[PDB]
Amino acid sequence: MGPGASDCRIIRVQLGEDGSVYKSILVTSQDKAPSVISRVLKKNNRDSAVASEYELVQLLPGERELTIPASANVFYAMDGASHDFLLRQRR
Amino acid sequence: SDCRIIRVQMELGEDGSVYKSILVTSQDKAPSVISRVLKKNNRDSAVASEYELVQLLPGERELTIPASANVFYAMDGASHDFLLRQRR
Amino acid sequence: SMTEYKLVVVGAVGVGKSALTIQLIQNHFVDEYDPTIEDSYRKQVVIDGETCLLDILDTAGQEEYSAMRDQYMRTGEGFLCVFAINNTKSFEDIHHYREQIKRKDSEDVPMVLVGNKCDLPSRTVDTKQAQDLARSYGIPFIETSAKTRQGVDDAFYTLVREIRKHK
Amino acid sequence: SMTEYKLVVVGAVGVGKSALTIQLIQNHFVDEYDPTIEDSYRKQVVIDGETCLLDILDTAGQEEYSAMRDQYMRTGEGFLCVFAINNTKSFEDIHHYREQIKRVKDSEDVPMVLVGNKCDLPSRTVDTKQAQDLARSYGIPFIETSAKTRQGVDDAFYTLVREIRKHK
Ligand SMILES: Nc1nc2c(ncn2[C@@H]2O[C@H](COP(=O)(O)OP(=O)(O)NP(=O)(O)O)[C@@H](O)[C@H]2O)c(=O)[nH]1
Ligand SMILES: Nc1nc2c(ncn2[C@@H]2O[C@H](COP(=O)(O)OP(=O)(O)NP(=O)(O)O)[C@@H](O)[C@H]2O)c(=O)[nH]1
Ligand SMILES: [Mg+2]
Ligand SMILES: [Mg+2]
């Protein structure tokens, strides 16, 4: 008589030699931006990242993109019509 | 796409375990999940076509998941607790 | 009836917490790796002549499910902190686990450190630096092995001993 | 316009599919355990004088994500079937993996290479004899690798490519 809340979502996240195109990543209803950044960054073996340097931004269809606010709940922040994100820095 | 974590209890003929937490995708059908929990348990020998996955709801109410259903969309959503039993 | 002890096994990914929990009950070691989210077990057994039912919680190592840490740490009585002898990273991870447990609201919580891969030849952390940590935490330290079953009983029972000690 | 090859790496959890792929593409091995869901890699490289773009798919070993398997097995051109020499269970799992590859896009001749992954490890739980014997019965190649020492990594991947173009 009504859907239950979802626990997790799978997202794909894409600086540097992009040997990998993307990595599938699990994000809980509880995750803030830093959690996700360090997660993907640790997958990428880039231990030295402070996590506060990087930014996770969603790419919507029609060549339109949006940056997810840091220290915010990515599960609720994302448009939910994408699933595809990317990580970038700031020299 | 979205997923849910559910806990499922076995038929538990022997002492075994209390429950095992299991992840189910928006894509999973009942057989997928039943064989999953079956392999988690020491019933590698068991066929999944035989077993039945039953959600436990408040008020001692149960719901049996149809063999063919997508559990992610089927489940009542007032419970994350299930049980696996013979259906023999 | 029976004395109830609620143990919870924590540690980094792959350290072998699942393996040794499953070794405790129905005695076996399966080399198959199967990442756990949260597995609950229950077994009755006598320790130092005391019949008691163990409520063991086999927790996840993957960050993905640390969202559940505040709940399982609340409920749990005693904590088995596991690292792998081959993974130095796991050993450093224990810091984080303990401090999260400390934040039950106590500087003393019933816990026991364990190094699970005592059978592996390629030790990256010595027992010296391990028992030295345990001394600073003021908790026991047992080198276990889920494969050979060395120390599994010892390790679990010790946490029980630590629990009854704690009151 | 260059030749595109779509490789897909399958195998039990922990056999070291992710590790081998990361080795071929990024020339490094980290000991870190990190369960994978679905990792996609794209790299251009010349093989036997042929410029081609490799589309490698690093799949999950956990059933949880095998809900995707019918799609990625459809799309994939060649399949790297991996077991660990220490994990006997992985070796028995190969049977199931191959049958699944056969059943999707019904064909009994599909480009595959069997791989035994942790050959640097002392344990050795499965003989290469019984592995090469399987490969002979499957009539496919068999390479023993180590993602750690990088032994066989090049050999394994490139062989699958060779097998693919052989089946135009
Ligand atoms: N040789 C050896 N292998 C071990 C030992 N403990 C665990 N392993 C192996 O290491 C792998 C990880 O085991 P497991 O218990 O699932 O690890 P975990 O700590 O539960 N991982 P997770 O955080 O995902 O739950 C398995 O293949 C297991 O057989 C040990 O003492 N010796
Ligand atoms: N010594 C050694 N370790 C290896 C080798 N290949 C992988 N490993 C190690 O074994 C573990 C599993 O590797 P990984 O690539 O994540 O395995 P996987 O097959 O991708 N597992 P999953 O299905 O979850 O993605 C890691 O600790 C990795 O470093 C190898 O050839 N030699
Ligand atoms: Mg586990
Ligand atoms: Mg992996």
CB C20 within 8 A of CB C12: no
Whether residue D26 contacts residue D37, with contact meaning beta carbons closer than 8 Å, is answered with: no
Q: Any bridge partners for residue B67, and if so which?
A: none
Element (H, E) at A61: none
Calpha distance B65→B46 (Å, rounded): 19
Burial of B22 (0-12, 13-18, 19+ CB in 10 A): buried
**CB D79 within 8 Å of CB D111:** yes
Closest-CA residue, ligand 1 atom 32, reads C117
Count Cβ atoms below 10 Å from residue D108 Cβ, excluding itself: 6
The single-letter DSSP state of residue A11 is E
Range of the domain at B66: 3-85
Total number of domains in chain A: 1
| Long-range contacts of A63-68, Cβ-Cβ distance < 8 Å, separation of 24 or more | A68/A33
C-alpha distance from D29 to closest chain A C-alpha (Å): 10
**Ligand 1, atom nearest to C116 Cα:** 31
Q: Are D79 and D10 in contact (CB under 8 A)?
A: yes
Interface contact D25-A43, CB threshold 8 A: no
Closest chain B C-alpha to A48 CA, distance in angstroms = 31
For D57, the token pair is 């798919």
Task: Name the closest residue on chain C to residue A42, using Cα atoms.
Answer: C63
For A68, the token pair is: 């997810």
Integer Cα distance of D64 and D37 in angstroms? 9
Q: Residue D138 contacts by C-beta under 8 Å, 6 or more apart in sequence?
A: D98, D112, D114
Residue bearing the CA closest to ligand 2, atom 29: D31
Strand partners, B81: B7
Q: What method was applied to determine this entry?
A: X-ray
Query: Which helix (H) or strand (E) covers residue B65, if one does?
Result: none
**First-to-last CA distance in chain D?**
17
| Neighbors of chain C with 3 or more C-beta pairs under 8 Å | A, B, D
- If DSSP codes are grouped into helix, strand and coil, which group holds residue C161? helix
Q: What are the structure tokens assigned to C53, written together? A: 């039912």
Say whether B25 and D63 touch across the interface (CB within 8 A): no
Nearest chain C residue to A9 by CA: give it: C64
Region at B59 (left for phi over 0; alpha for psi -120 to 50; beta for the rest)? left
Ligand whose nearest atom lies closest to the CA of C149? 1
The data reach a resolution, in angstroms, of 3.1
Look up residue B64 and give its two tokens: 């049996």
Distance from CA of C31 to the nearest CA of D (A): 6
| N residues, chain D | 168
Who contacts C136 (Cβ-Cβ below 8 Å, separation ≥6)?
A: none
**Nearest in space to D64 (alpha carbons), one of A70, A14, B71, C105:** B71
- Number of continuous H segments (helices) and E segments (strands) in chain A: 2, 5
The residue whose two tokens read 């400390």 is: C102
Query: Residue type at B36?
Result: R
Which helix H or strand E contains C48, and what residues bound it? none
In CATH, what number is assigned to the domain containing residue A43? Answer: 3.10.20.90
Q: Would A1 be classed as within a structural domain?
A: no
Supply the CATH classification number for the domain C3-165: 3.40.50.300
The strand ranges marked E within chain C are 3-11, 38-47, 50-59, 78-83, 111-115, 141-143
> What per-residue string of b and e applies to D75-105 under the rule 16 or more CB within 10 Å gives b?
ebbbbbbbbbbbbebbbebbeebbeebeebe
Q: Please report the number of interchain residue pairs, chain A to chain D, with beta-carbon separation below 8 angstroms.
A: 34
Distance CA B8, CA D162 (A): 46
Distance D12 CA to ligand 4 centre (A): 10
Cα Rg, chain A, nearest whole Å: 13
Most D-contacting residue of C17, C28, C29, C32 (CB-CB within 10 A), to test interface: C32
For residue A66, which phi and psi values (nearest 5 degrees)? -145, 135
Q: How far apart are CA C33 and CA C39, in angstroms?
A: 14
Core vs surface per residue A55-82: b (16+ CB within 10 A) or e: bbebeeeeeeeeebeeeebbbebbeeeb
- Which residues in D lie closer than 8 A to residue C86 (C-beta atoms)? 31
Alpha helix positions (H), chain D: 17-26, 69-75, 88-103, 128-138, 153-166
Partner residue facing A39 (CB), from C63, C65, C67: C63
CB atoms within 10 A of CB B81: 15
Secondary structure element (H or E) that encloses residue C121, with its range:
none
Nearest atom in ligand 2 to D30's CA = 29
Q: Which of C28, C31, C33 to mutate to test the pocket of ligand 1 (most atoms within 8 A of CB)?
A: C33
Give dist(CA C65, CA C59) in Å, integer: 9
Could you tell me where the DSSP H helices lie in C4-87?
17-24, 69-75
Give CA angle at C118 (C33, D32), nearest 5°: 45
Residue A17 lies in a domain: yes
Token representation of residue A33 = 């931006």
H-assigned helices in A28-73: 33-43
Task: Look at the block and give the residue holding tokens 């345990």.
Answer: C134
Q: Which residues pair with D45 in a beta bridge?
A: D52
Note whether residue A2 is domain-resident: no
Ligand 1 pocket (Cβ < 6 Å) reads: C 11, 13-19, 31, 33, 35-36, 60-62, 116-117, 119-120, 145-147; D 14
Q: Give the tokens for residue C98.
A: 């303990």
Closest CA to C146 of C14, C40, C7, C5: C14
| Orientation of helix D128-138 relative to helix D88-103, angle to 10° | 10
Q: How many CB pairs under 8 A join B and D?
A: 14
The contacts found for C138-142 with CB under 8 angstroms, 24 or more apart, are C138/C108, C139/C111, C139/C112, C139/C113, C140/C112, C140/C113, C141/C112, C141/C113, C141/C114, C141/C115, C142/C112, C142/C113, C142/C114, C142/C115
Cα–chain center distance at C55: 13
CA distances in angstroms from D21 to C66, C91, D13, D132, D146, listed in the order given: 28, 27, 15, 22, 11
Query: Which chains form contacts with chain D, at 3 or more CB pairs under 8 Å?
Result: A, B, C
Specify the DSSP element, H or E, that contains C160. Answer: helix C152-166
Cα–Cα distance measured from residue B85 to residue A84, given in angstroms and rounded to the nearest whole number = 39
Superfamily for the D3-166 domain? P-loop containing nucleotide triphosphate hydrolases (3.40.50.300)
Q: Which amino acid is at D101?
A: I
C-alpha to C-alpha distances, C25 to B40, C44, C89, nearest whole angstrom = 15, 10, 29
Buried-exposed string A5-23: b where 16+ CB fall within 10 A, e elsewhere: ebbbbbbbbbeeeebbebb
In contact, D15 and D87? CB cutoff 8 Å: yes
